[PDB]
Amino acid sequence: MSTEQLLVLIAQNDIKDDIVDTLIELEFLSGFSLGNICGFSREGYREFCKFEIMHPAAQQAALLTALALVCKHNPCRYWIMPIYQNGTLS
Amino acid sequence: MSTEQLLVLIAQNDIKDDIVDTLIELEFLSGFSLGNICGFSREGYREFCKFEIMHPAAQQAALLTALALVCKHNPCRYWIMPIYQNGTLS
Amino acid sequence: MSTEQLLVLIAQNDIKDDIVDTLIELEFLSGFSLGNICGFSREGYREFCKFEIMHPAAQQAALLTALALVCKHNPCRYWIMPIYQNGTLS
Numbered sequence A, B, C: 001m002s003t004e005q006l007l008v009l010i011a012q013n014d015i016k017d018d019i020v021d022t023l024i025e026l027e028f029l030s031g032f033s034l035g036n037i038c039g040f041s042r043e044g045y046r047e048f049c050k051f052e053i054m055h056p057a058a059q060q061a062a063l064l065t066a067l068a069l070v071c072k073h074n075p076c077r078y079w080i081m082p083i084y085q086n087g088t089l090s
Helices: A016-023 A057-070 B016-023 B057-070 C016-023 C057-070
Strands: A004-012 A031-041 A044-056 A076-082 A085-089 B004-012 B031-041 B044-056 B076-082 B085-089 C004-012 C031-041 C044-056 C076-082 C085-089
Touching: A004 A016, A004 A057, A004 C076, A016 A031, A016 A044, A016 A057, A031 C044, A044 A057, A044 B031, A057 A076, A057 B085, A076 B004, A076 B076, A076 C076, A085 C057, B004 B016, B004 B057, B016 B031, B016 B044, B016 B057, B044 B057, B044 C031, B057 B076, B057 C085, B076 C004, B076 C076, C004 C016, C004 C057, C016 C031, C016 C044, C016 C057, C044 C057, C057 C076
Parallel strands: none
Antiparallel strands: A004 A044, A004 A076, A031 A044, A031 B031, A031 C031, A076 B085, A085 C076, B004 B044, B004 B076, B031 B044, B031 C031, B076 C085, C004 C044, C004 C076, C031 C044
């Protein structure tokens, strides 16, 4: 397995920019992605922003505590998945 | 590793609602997400609905057998991925 | 764990077709998916095509070297994730 892992975060559309701002400032991040998804929960549903953030496992706390700040008032579901391998094809 | 795992299901647009109906009724599920994706296969291609459903590993059978019903006549590709961790940031 | 694993590839919109062409020709692949995502990096951002390709771990090299060709001039981020299980519900 890998020291890299993927953080997936289901964020409300309003804290979207605040999240982007946080991430761009984190030096241990080489980049991230974001897409629109439809989300259900308890039921009621709606539209969110889905962020995917590859990061070193060693910086997991740093990453989650940083994001936990932007969500002070807007809870965000998240999950972390293992990555076997990552890189760049060329 | 985790007792939580992610079910990813590539469903045809017509059984989309039937799937939503099944999921909302499953008590061991706290919520789910769905998005539009383009899917290829054997080649011919098209547009599907991609569901992502976090659930306890212990309820995997319950979840798949329940969904297997709605797909009686519309086969759906799926895969299950491990989750190291999940929760809610605030 | 599984001998199947998921390749996730963040491709530029211009080599999108070239990638599709490569994949459709690979016999060990039963199908793949692709969706639009917004991607950041170092920061500057933009829109990409996100491919997800389930494949046997045994054919990982074959898959990456084949794709590495289409990206000769357009680098593409990628990652490989484990799959516990996969199939088709019906």
